[PDB]
Symmetry: C2
Subunit: 150 residues, 2 copies
């Protein structure tokens, strides 16, 4: 069976490398830009929900979040319903930088799709949505500590 997993991994790493270089002077490198984007779009989100959105590990997310906090791009607010799980908000500075991250992503997205007809783009997006769903279930299964048969 044909493999997509290696190409997906390379594309994703290449995109993050490029973003990290382009945000290097703005305290948004080392992959931090991904967190700020989701936090701007989901103001007040708790960290465990963010982690589930991103499908990343807790320790990696924690490192990135505290660094964004240190650099004044996000702030943690009191959660009256659960003291342990603080609410994540962007700061004013974080919101002012958000459109730059989106623009940079849009530019890379246009580069990635160079030479595609509109017809090719639409099946690629729906197929990726399908791929995402197939693996999300196994991600959740395995994250809960259950073991796969492989």
């Amino acid at each position: 069976m044909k493999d997509i997993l290696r190409d997906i991994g390379v594309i994703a790493r290449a995109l993050d490398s490029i973003s990290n270089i382009e945000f290097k002077e703005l305290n948004l490198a080392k992959g931090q830009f991904i967190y700020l984007v989701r936090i701007c779009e989901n103001q007040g989100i708790i960290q465990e929900k963010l982690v589930d959105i991103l499908k990343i590990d807790r320790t990696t997310a924690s490192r990135a979040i505290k660094n964004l906090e240190k650099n004044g791009l996000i702030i943690k607010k009191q959660n009256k319903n659960n003291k342990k799980n603080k609410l994540l908000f962007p700061t004013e500075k974080g919101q002012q930088l958000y459109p730059l991250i989106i623009r940079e992503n849009e530019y890379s997205n246009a580069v990635a799709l160079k030479g595609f007809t509109e017809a090719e783009i639409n099946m690629l997006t729906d197929a990726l949505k399908k791929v995402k769903e197939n693996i999300a279930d196994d991600w959740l299964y395995v994250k809960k500590g259950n073991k796969r048969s492989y």
Copy 2:
């Protein structure tokens, strides 16, 4: 504004790495290290600079992973008669014996990723992703050298 494929690619990639890290946790192949051992097994004697270009990762990250694989006896650095400053990367015997497990686990997740797809639907996707990889590869190179994109 055309439709975005980048967010989904990123989430798919992170989800796959997370599953792999969990399934290799007891074998010193987590923290993304499995990615390196695979390419070193498949390209014996490769230098780190070339491995970085295959993976499209940064030097610091790759350096850390390779050092940890060397610490855990999965790869070994050999002297390079052509440039002593860049050592040759080989798998150890142990690294080689674990290689097929990484492939099997990756193959399984690939099969899951492609579930529910018609055969025809799989062929279109493979070619499209190759096209995307090539497009992005050029920009990565351009930017890694210090050149500035116009965005």
